[PDB]
Structure 1
Amino acid sequence: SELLVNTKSGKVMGTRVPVLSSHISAFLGIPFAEPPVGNMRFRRPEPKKPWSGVWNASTYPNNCQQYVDEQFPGFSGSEMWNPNREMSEDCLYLNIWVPSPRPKSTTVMVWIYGGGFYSGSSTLDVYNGKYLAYTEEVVLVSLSYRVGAFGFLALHGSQEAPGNVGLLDQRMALQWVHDNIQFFGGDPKTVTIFGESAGGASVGMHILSPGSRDLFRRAILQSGSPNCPWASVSVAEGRRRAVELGRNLNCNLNSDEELIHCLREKKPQELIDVEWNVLPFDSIFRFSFVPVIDGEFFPTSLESMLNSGNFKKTQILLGVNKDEGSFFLLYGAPGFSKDSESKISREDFMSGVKLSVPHANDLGLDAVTLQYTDWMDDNNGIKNRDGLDDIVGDHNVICPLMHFVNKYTKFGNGTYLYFFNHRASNLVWPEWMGVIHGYEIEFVFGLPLVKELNYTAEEEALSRRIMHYWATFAKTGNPNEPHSKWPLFTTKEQKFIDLNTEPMKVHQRLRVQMCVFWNQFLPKLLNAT
């Protein structure tokens, strides 16, 4: 039977699922590690003990314990990202969608969710791999990993809460896939990891980390880069945040062992309740528990690794959306609201600048402000709103990604860059938010192919184009159909393409004007001052 698979960890039984008037197999909730509960909380994941009998892989697993967004109760726009299954620390499972009939050795894609390392679920409707698996005939895997303090509390030096364990969870799932995907018809030597936002930064981190490199072949990064300003902290800052968390739960802070023991005696929600209290500055696009530059998972600083070519050399496909910053300004910056056009005053603009570059001194805040203000029309509310949107997106996603792509391309074996700028016709978020962070995902996963979802014919065609670009690249290292063009991104030309419903257009030097400011000038200014 097609729904029965014997793996090295034991036998699993899947389920048939309908998709676009057809069907494929799905093995949901396959465990890849021992439950990270009790004394195991904060510890590195342990490989799953093989089992006898048949594991029921017919239903989605629990979602990891995480902060739940209740900023707009009942609103589909935000609810679609919240956990849609019971939360539990016993959450280390993966999902696999397999074409029917079962392939023998086909292209494999592994998805990594990316809610800023503090949230995300492999079970969201927007992450349903059945459309992509089916349409492109690939074996689609979505993994899970601990988020928040559970996945990233870091007390460097202790073996109890070393930090980066959520990245280790990802690595274990990649290892399981590498070891067992052949049994589901996938080619373990042709695995492409892909992810968005923190998932995109994660993908880059596995490209960098020596211990993760051999577990996959190619990589796709969507609106996320490993060098993003919010994607990691130093060992010292990580330690400070762990101590501060303990201080918030009235923990004994006499030793690491004292602190860790206390944190393990707290219920999941108690940790989540005070998680946002440990940030060092009032800021946006900053998350509490993220990867730590530790000397193990990351041998040296990211920049020196990038500079010396110390990373997996292969092909990558990546890009960004037009208005990456809007979501974060909506959730926090003074002046933005979901139901108004959010025209911004000069004063709120400046408050926004400060929330956006929290580490900067006044001179630095002045430099940014100068750079993004139209001094002829400095009180124009629309311009202030849009400039702030660009500041957030440029600083947090685009420029860090452009720096990564340029550093990578000097040593890689092929780069393909895109700029996604199509606003979905059925978007429930206000128009001022534009092409929002995370909204290219639904096209990558092919939801536009589903009639009831209300997309236009043009949108369905865009989704098919994107899915085929992603799948062809995963299979060959080139998104273009041989003898059927998305140009290769090179150090010299630096070409990229737009992804929308209009005829493809090739461009060059994506936001180079602003990224020279964020990647070369500002860092220099903050270091001199």
Structure 2
Amino acid sequence: SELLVNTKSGKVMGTRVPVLSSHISAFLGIPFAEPPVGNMRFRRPEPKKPWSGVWNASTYPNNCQQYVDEQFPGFSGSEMWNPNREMSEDCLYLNIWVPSPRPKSTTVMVWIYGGGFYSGSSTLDVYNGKYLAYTEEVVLVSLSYRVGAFGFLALHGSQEAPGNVGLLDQRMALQWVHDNIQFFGGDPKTVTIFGESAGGASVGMHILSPGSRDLFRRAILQSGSPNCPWASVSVAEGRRRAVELGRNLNCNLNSDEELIHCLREKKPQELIDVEWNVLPFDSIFRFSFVPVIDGEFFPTSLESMLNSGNFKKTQILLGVNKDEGSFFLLYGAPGFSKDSESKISREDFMSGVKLSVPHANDLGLDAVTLQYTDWMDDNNGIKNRDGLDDIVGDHNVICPLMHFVNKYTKFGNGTYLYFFNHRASNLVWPEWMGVIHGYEIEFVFGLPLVKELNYTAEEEALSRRIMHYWATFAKTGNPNEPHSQESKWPLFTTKEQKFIDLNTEPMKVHQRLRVQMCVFWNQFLPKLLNA
């Protein structure tokens, strides 16, 4: 009865939400898994037992236990990413926005949030699917997955904490969407999983995981890809970090059973408190509990998989932001402050490049510095600052994504590559951080469309193009409307390597995104480090 949806798990009662002019149906906090609490912490998600009665899908679910950024308390720029609902280990819930009237079988977009696998909520203001569902008439799903140690602790042997359990959370949401989105008017045969940062890395990992390929049609990857250096550890390093996490909580680490038991008794916040102490390196843009290359979720190494074509072959739309690195530099690298044009000294640059590339020897750090220093001007604080952003952005998202694009396009049924380089007019972060990691999201979710948000008209325009690019790609596997007034977004071929700018200036097409630098990061530096 519009808001009464009767699903294979039970009846779900949603709520009308106002969006722009109209209203839309919203179903919020649908459980898709049994609460991963108690003896079930670190365990694989268990499918949600069906409920008697109607489920009140009208309020946002608990967010999952996660690190809370208090680096800039009150600063909307950082709080916009913080959990906005009560945190709870009970948090495996998804959110669905459906048009009014209910479509019959229309496209589904399943948003998977980023947050470096230690943070993230489906429920943040910038992930509100109102605007996207309304504007583009897509059923929009937000999912939830366990982040941090709760989702990615990996004692590879044990059944009680294998890794990737937070990815399995995602996969179960995807199963539920596959099984039940039809009752919300969604077409399970065309669900598109999009995500940003670790969310896009996750999307890439379901393209890769055999166990996930059947559960979605298409994929959008924003500023992340499965092969990103921060997105996976070996099972050995996962074990190492799991044990070190237990060492921090004074766990008896005689056996996996002993460790897991200890970690299961700790309050969620104590895991969170010591979580960053288990990194093996003084480092930027590294997270403690990330997916493990474990043999089950990933059959082998991601590189083999990308090489063999061992991945779901579909269409992907993906891309990066211009200044991917600045966010992590501000937070982690000396000399970058929020309130200064963060001109970076030479001493702080070398501190920064050493933090950015923690796995690199003195030779590798020299290679990086050679690549990224303006040697005509090696003490220019701006060039050092921007160069650090470039190092961090190229090493950590742009070049791994371009590696992934190249390897994937060899076997996929279509690749669209954007380069988002628009600084929002109302961006609350300093100018020096540029087009920041994560700040294409508000444009994907249509926030320039709400006038109270103080976007320019030109930005609202861009948001409508992006949403239209995104939903058209989701519907059709091509972001372009067939024969439209807009100019066409070229396919990315391994031949021409074309890609588009996304900003308010009209579309420009380019070749070979950061190729000079990505040849360094993808081809040369690894060869150098192995030698």
Interval of TM-score (by shorter of Structure 1 and Structure 2): over 0.9
Distance 1:351 1:117 in 2: 25
Question: Could you say which residue in structure 2 is the equivalent of 1:17?
Answer: 17
Distance 2:326 2:448 in 1: 23
Distance 1:332 1:125 in 2: 25
- Give the deviation of 1:420 after TM superposition: 0.3
1:515 aligns with 2:514: no
Distance 1:254 1:391 in 2: 41
**1:45-65 CA-partner distances (Å, limit 9, x unpaired):** 100001111111011010000
Distance 1:71 1:504 in 2: 36
- Give the deviation of 1:332 after TM superposition: 1.4
- Give the deviation of 1:372 after TM superposition: 0.5
Distance 1:43 1:307 in 2: 31
Distance 1:219 1:368 in 2: 32
Question: Could you say which residue in structure 2 is the equivalent of 1:104?
Answer: 104
- Give the deviation of 1:276 after TM superposition: 0.3
**1:459-484 CA-partner distances (Å, limit 9, x unpaired):** 00000000000000000000001128
Distance 1:475 1:431 in 2: 36
SS in 1 for 2:458: helix
- Give the deviation of 1:21 after TM superposition: 1.7
- Give the deviation of 1:282 after TM superposition: 0.4
- Give the deviation of 1:98 after TM superposition: 0.4
Distance 1:52 1:264 in 2: 30
**1:83-121 CA-partner distances (Å, limit 9, x unpaired):** 000000000000000000000000110000000000000
- Give the deviation of 1:333 after TM superposition: 0.7
Any unmatched runs of 5+ in structure 1? none
**1:184-220 CA-partner distances (Å, limit 9, x unpaired):** 0000000000000000000000000000000000000
**1:374-399 CA-partner distances (Å, limit 9, x unpaired):** 11111111111011110000000000
**1:157-195 CA-partner distances (Å, limit 9, x unpaired):** 110101100000000000000000000000000000000
Distance 1:227 1:441 in 2: 21
**1:357-376 CA-partner distances (Å, limit 9, x unpaired):** 00000000000011111111
TM-score scaled by length of structure 1: 0.99
Distance 1:186 1:428 in 2: 36
SS in 2 for 1:212: helix
**1:477-524 CA-partner distances (Å, limit 9, x unpaired):** 000011281011101011000000001110000000000000000000
Distance 2:202 2:281 in 1: 24
Distance 2:67 2:284 in 1: 16
Distance 1:481 1:253 in 2: 58
Question: Could you say which residue in structure 2 is the equivalent of 1:504?
Answer: 507
**1:22-53 CA-partner distances (Å, limit 9, x unpaired):** 10100000000000000000000100001111
Superposition RMSD in Å: 0.6
SS in 1 for 2:410: helix
Distance 2:108 2:332 in 1: 39
- Give the deviation of 1:251 after TM superposition: 0.5
Distance 2:66 2:473 in 1: 33
Distance 2:492 2:52 in 1: 49
**1:302-337 CA-partner distances (Å, limit 9, x unpaired):** 000000000100100000000000000000111110
SS in 1 for 2:89: coil
Distance 2:41 2:76 in 1: 32
Aligned length: 528
**Runs ≥4 residues deviating over 6 A:** none
SS in 1 for 2:332: coil
Distance 1:21 1:505 in 2: 33
Question: Could you say which residue in structure 1 is the equivalent of 2:480?
Answer: 480
- Give the deviation of 1:444 after TM superposition: 0.2
SS in 1 for 2:499: strand
1:431 aligns with 2:431: yes
Distance 2:87 2:55 in 1: 21
SS in 2 for 1:282: coil
SS in 2 for 1:215: coil
Distance 2:51 2:115 in 1: 32
Question: Could you say which residue in structure 1 is the equivalent of 2:168?
Answer: 168
Percent identical pairs in the alignment equals 100
Any unmatched runs of 5+ in structure 2? none
Distance 1:17 1:439 in 2: 25
- Give the deviation of 1:156 after TM superposition: 0.5
What does 1:456-495 correspond to in 2, within 5 Å?
456-483=456-483, 485-495=488-498
1:195 aligns with 2:164: no
- Give the deviation of 1:130 after TM superposition: 0.4
- Give the deviation of 1:249 after TM superposition: 0.5
